[PDB]
Amino acid sequence: ITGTSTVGVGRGVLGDQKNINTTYSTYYYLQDNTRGDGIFTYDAKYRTTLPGSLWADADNQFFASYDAPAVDAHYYAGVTYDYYKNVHNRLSYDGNNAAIRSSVHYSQGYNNAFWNGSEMVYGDGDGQTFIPLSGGIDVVAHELTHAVTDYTAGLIYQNESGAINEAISDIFGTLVEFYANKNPDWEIGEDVYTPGISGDSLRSMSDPAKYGDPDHYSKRYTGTQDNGGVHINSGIINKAAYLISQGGTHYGVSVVGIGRDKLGKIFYRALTQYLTPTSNFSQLRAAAVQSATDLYGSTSQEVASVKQAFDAVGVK
Amino acid sequence: ITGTSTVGVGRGVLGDQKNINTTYSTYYYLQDNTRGDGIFTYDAKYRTTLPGSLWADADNQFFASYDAPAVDAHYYAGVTYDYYKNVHNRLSYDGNNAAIRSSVHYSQGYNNAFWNGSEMVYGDGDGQTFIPLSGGIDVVAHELTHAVTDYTAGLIYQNESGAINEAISDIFGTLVEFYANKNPDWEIGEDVYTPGISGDSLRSMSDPAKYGDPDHYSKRYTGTQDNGGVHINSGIINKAAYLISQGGTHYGVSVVGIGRDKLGKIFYRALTQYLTPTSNFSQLRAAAVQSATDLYGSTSQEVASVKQAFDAVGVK
Ligand SMILES: [Ca+2]
Ligand SMILES: [Ca+2]
Ligand SMILES: [Ca+2]
Ligand SMILES: [Ca+2]
Ligand SMILES: [Ca+2]
Ligand SMILES: [Ca+2]
Ligand SMILES: [Ca+2]
Ligand SMILES: [Ca+2]
Ligand SMILES: [Zn+2]
Ligand SMILES: [Zn+2]
């Protein structure tokens, strides 16, 4: 819409109050004109037709419980855009300030959220397994990172390349959660998963086996479910990335951590310069080593820690 | 695009030559201005970003092997629009002549095709399990019927309502295949599935158990895979619809067939007037009986055959 840029206030899914960028033109819309070509949030009104209607509000205050998922989708797309711009100098997901669109209230009792190739879609959850999925900043950033991957490496969504695609989304989702300093951790989806159980999450990067996912290449899933294990086999790369960052000893192999910032620079470089649509785990290892070499020198500690981490999860 | 409407010629996936509606404006585009607000076909160029580029061609002749999937997506969306308009008086999927958009060459070796809530997406297959999926008119019509369902009943995509949603798509996909008189049958996907094996298909409506899907409510799948069995449990409704149309005796129960035309009028009415997002199989049976009653009278043979068919598959 064409209108005047302004700032409204609301409450997110977890009850926290935040300011959000809106646009006024008769109604106040969730349209943020301060980032790129804009961030737009739509109401899918419990249907599956997309994108739905651009979210319109009469008084620029979003404290209704129906508003909550929209406030967080809109705000956490802004935080994720800021992370990529400020940290990696990337303007939106295509590198050219493409508009970011999200729809909330998709379907009824839908326990998922996804990037569909053109926009973000968030279910409200069934209220038992999940609450509205845009309340999790790592979920929002995980999904928006699939848009980045689609425009750069183009990793296909199955077998080892799909597992890399999922891991890259977990890694950057977690780095955005640390960037916003929102009670950060190495788990995925813990703010919106099972409201009735404390302490769990959908997946763990620090210990993937907690939830039964593999933490070593010898335990990888080889069947056909889950598009050849894209959500399952991503545990192997998540654990490598946690070790590169944090260090540790894993199956016998000791890794010195180099921190989150360098982890993010190495993987971002590997993703935008060396990975291709059919890259497998062994070519991820080569790409990460080459990236760390480009950035820090072939005899750095950074290169040595990337090698040790992939050796620790059995990826040669 | 704005340009002059014209007609081009090409070859589809199976090698058949057909005329297609195009638009000229420097290049010839796959843009059909003769149906509703238009039918538009895009090239996703082996990526997953959608919709891709509107398909442009220099000389209005589409005989290259890269063109084939586009010719058939474009042409078979036109046939499906014509079926719904001519048979059911429905203008496009929203009933208001919404533009129909499709992208072909999505990803690499992708063995599927789907309606994503805003447009059709077709993989090229891996060449072993499938060939480009827009070569199957029942696949194209199956997916475009999810758009109709989304705008009318709004059946959620899981458990029994998702199974109904899938069956409704198989039924109408099959009726469009009979309307175009394209070697018609009651199987789904046989023109594009496994190029190396003759005679098989993805699913069968006349005998779902051929491929292991249930043909009776007592054999339904009750686990969590496939969103609670939406592609598996649709066999129960597919068999009922085949019996209503064709007649037969099934587990003890005899059904007099009333034909395809009445099958289509009954289910179309049930879908647009009585089903809701959470309808289950028993409420489908009530909706189909009420529809047949509205159309033919409570003491017709048509009402009696709908009851016998649902009784034959164990749905009360
Ligand atoms: Ca308000
Ligand atoms: Ca956290
Ligand atoms: Ca987290
Ligand atoms: Ca929990
Ligand atoms: Ca040509
Ligand atoms: Ca056929
Ligand atoms: Ca068929
Ligand atoms: Ca075959
Ligand atoms: Zn993902
Ligand atoms: Zn379907």
Curated annotation (Swiss-Prot), chains A, B:
Places the protein is found: Secreted
Keywords on record: Calcium, Hydrolase, Metal-binding, Metalloprotease, Protease, Secreted, Signal, Zinc, Zymogen
Chain positions recorded as Ca(2+) 3 binding sites: E177, N183, D185, E190
UniProt-listed GO biological process terms: proteolysis
Cofactor comment text: Binds 4 Ca(2+) ions per subunit.
Active-site residues from the entry: E143, H231
Protein family according to the UniProt entry: Belongs to the peptidase M4 family.
Protein name: Thermolysin
Organism: Bacillus thermoproteolyticus
Lineage: Bacteria, Bacillati, Bacillota, Bacilli, Bacillales
